[PDB]
């Protein structure tokens, strides 16, 4: 279940933050598990129940008077600001970073993983407030791509002098 | 570049064999943000989507075929293949490969299409369209496409024209928009769960099969209509 440098993010791509790796999706697909992206539904109703509607969220039926259909987080997650975060990360603030689960402490622990250029600060409750360094360890094998710091995360992007084509995602 | 697709396959398979097909993509890297789709057409019926693969290995399959179908991709040689097990006479058809778009704005968009390979077998639709339409030169004809809340209402509709002997070709994209080269006498619209294709100024060159298509969120994949065979009277 761990996302490693060898993981293939299906219909997606890997990104790295100061203390972990995660999968992001191509176009407007959504994560259904940590390594799989799928086409999202635009409306929840009877015929799309249990279909992906967002990252780690699916359409569910809400019984009542009237019956409704909503997009609710998968098991293990809670909706905070309309985003599915792990239960153990409920109301955890990391500053320049995000809360994640620690498969180094395999006991269900919420830790802070920080934007590239920041590291956890032991003086600030392990928040992402200490300027710091992270080594990119992404492979980036697709031709004319290398690891780059984009928007505070490491990802495979087009070599210097090259521009990504929007329609195909090919570096030209 | 000049993306082109070409199918290779057996011409004849025996019942219970596994049909194997291969699509070669040229002028373009298969390691791109697209789906690589297999679609088939029984010799006198409509289009049926079989499945697709992404270069990361993720596959989508038609549920009705899931138990018998495997699609694989070979990025080093820019190829992708179809395996269909326990072939029966019902599997005889023209098989096409195509490049399908990803995401809400492009899913259901197939361009370019392969020429198609005929698969014969030896011995031993979700969207509804009128089966046929007809008119005389100069008239306007309309072709209906009735769907549901899971495909037409929430997903973009696409129209494809199949001149006899040729592969389907994109005629209309994103409900009402014309690809360069299709004249404006071709129009299309969508309302609720239904869609319509209007052809003005009918001429003999229009005689062809017309198919609507849209991604279905219930089945998780593209669905085609049964097709409308447009015939022009008084022509050749």
Residue numbers in the entry:
A (entry chain A): 0 to 171
B (entry chain H): 0 to 123, 144 to 255
Copy the relevant paper text.
Pfs25 is expressed on the surface of zygotes and ookinetes and plays a role in ookinete survival in the mosquito midgut, traversal through the midgut epithelium, and oocyst maturation. Pfs25 is also highly conserved among diverse P. falciparum strains with limited polymorphic variation, suggesting immunization with Pfs25 may lead to strain-transcending immunity. Here, we compiled a detailed human antibody epitope map comprising epitope binning data and structures of multiple human monoclonal antibodies, including three new crystal structures of Pfs25 in complex with transmission-reducing antibodies from Malian volunteers immunized with Pfs25 conjugated to EPA and adjuvanted with AS01.
All complementarity-determining regions (CDRs) except for light chain CDR 2 of AS01-04 contacted Pfs25, burying a surface area of 1140 Å2. The heavy chain formed ten hydrogen bonds and five salt-bridges while one hydrogen bond was formed by the light chain. However, the binding affinity of AS01-04 to this polymorphic variant of Pfs25 was not affected compared to wildtype Pfs25.
